[PDB]
Amino acid sequence: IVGGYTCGANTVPYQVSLNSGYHFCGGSLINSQWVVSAAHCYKSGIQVRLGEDNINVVEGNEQFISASKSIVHPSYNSNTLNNDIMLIKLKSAASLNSRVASISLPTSCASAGTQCLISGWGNTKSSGTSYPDVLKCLKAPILSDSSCKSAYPGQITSNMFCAGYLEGGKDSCQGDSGGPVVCSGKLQGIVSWGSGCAQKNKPGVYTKVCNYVSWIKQTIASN
Numbered sequence: 001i002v003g004g005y006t007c008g009a010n011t012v013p014y015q016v017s018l019n020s021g022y023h024f025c026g027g028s029l030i031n032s033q034w035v036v037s038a039a040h041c042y043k044s045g046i047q048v049r050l051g052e053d054n055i056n057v058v059e060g061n062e063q064f065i066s067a068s069k070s071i072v073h074p075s076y077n078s079n080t081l082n083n084d085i086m087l088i089k090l091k092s093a094a095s096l097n098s099r100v101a102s103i104s105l106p107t108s109c110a111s112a113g114t115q116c117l118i119s120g121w122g123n124t125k126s127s128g129t130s131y132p133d134v135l136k137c138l139k140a141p142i143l144s145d146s147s148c149k150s151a152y153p154g155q156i157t158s159n160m161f162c163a164g165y166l167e168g169g170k171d172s173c174q175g176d177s178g179g180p181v182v183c184s185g186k187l188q189g190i191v192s193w194g195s196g197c198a199q200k201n202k203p204g205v206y207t208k209v210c211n212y213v214s215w216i217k218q219t220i221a222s223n
């Protein structure tokens with residue numbers, strides 16, 4: 001997260017770190033046995049780490065659970081990143097409490113102007129790499145479709161939305177992919193891509209979760 005602030009330990013209880021010997025992507029807990037992340041964060045050997053703040057120090061509250069299976073959306077396109085969503089089923093259910101809690105899926109999509117909270121352990125520099133130990137937060141608004149399409153002509157599908165600041169300075173970045181974009185207590189987006197990080201007129205692009213709720217529900221119900 002570039003231009004964000006330190007969240008404060010366990011203030012984002014649905015945030016998870018996907019780990020394979022190092023942190024490579026974020027994710028969101030939506031119930032005690034399932035996590036939602038981005039399809040491009042897929043790999044084998046994923047250990048989901050819940051209740052984290054400093055990802056390099058065991059401080060207490062952490063729950064490390066292995067993924068039993070990861071379900072990449074069948075229509076995921078790695079060249080356009082259209083349908084960049086994945087569901088991860090945990091080997092055992094997590095113990096939910098005040099430090100580990102799930103986030104609700106939306107019933108409707110959000111409107112431009114909605115203020116959301118994006119979090120993650122990704123890079124905090126736009127020009128260079130500086131990875132933090134603790135979780136960073138950023139409050140950012142969803143942009144209108146015209147501004148998004150005007151910024152990325154020909155690359156935005158109906159399953160994506162832009163959120164951020166056109167002046168530059170604040171954005172999600174590498175290491176944040178797969179993580180949550182929460183607005184009014186509902187998970188509206190998943191960190192997907194962007195051109196650089198925090199550059200002027202190049203806002204971040206997120207997977208529009210409201211378009212996948214029936215898919216998530218049906219897939220979980222059958223797995």
Ligand SMILES: NC(=[NH2+])c1ccc2[nH]c(-c3cccc(-c4ccccc4)c3[O-])cc2c1
Nearest residue numbers: 040041172173174177192193194196197204
């Ligand atoms: N400007 C943004 N808002 C933004 C958001 C998420 C991002 N993720 C990345 C990213 C960069 C390099 C590699 C990966 C990557 C690739 C495979 C698996 C996991 C992460 C990224 O997610 C850049 C990147 C940029």
Ligand SMILES: [Ca+2]
Nearest residue numbers: 054055057058
């Ligand atoms: Ca830790």
Ligand SMILES: [Cl-]
Nearest residue numbers: 149153154155
């Ligand atoms: Cl267009």
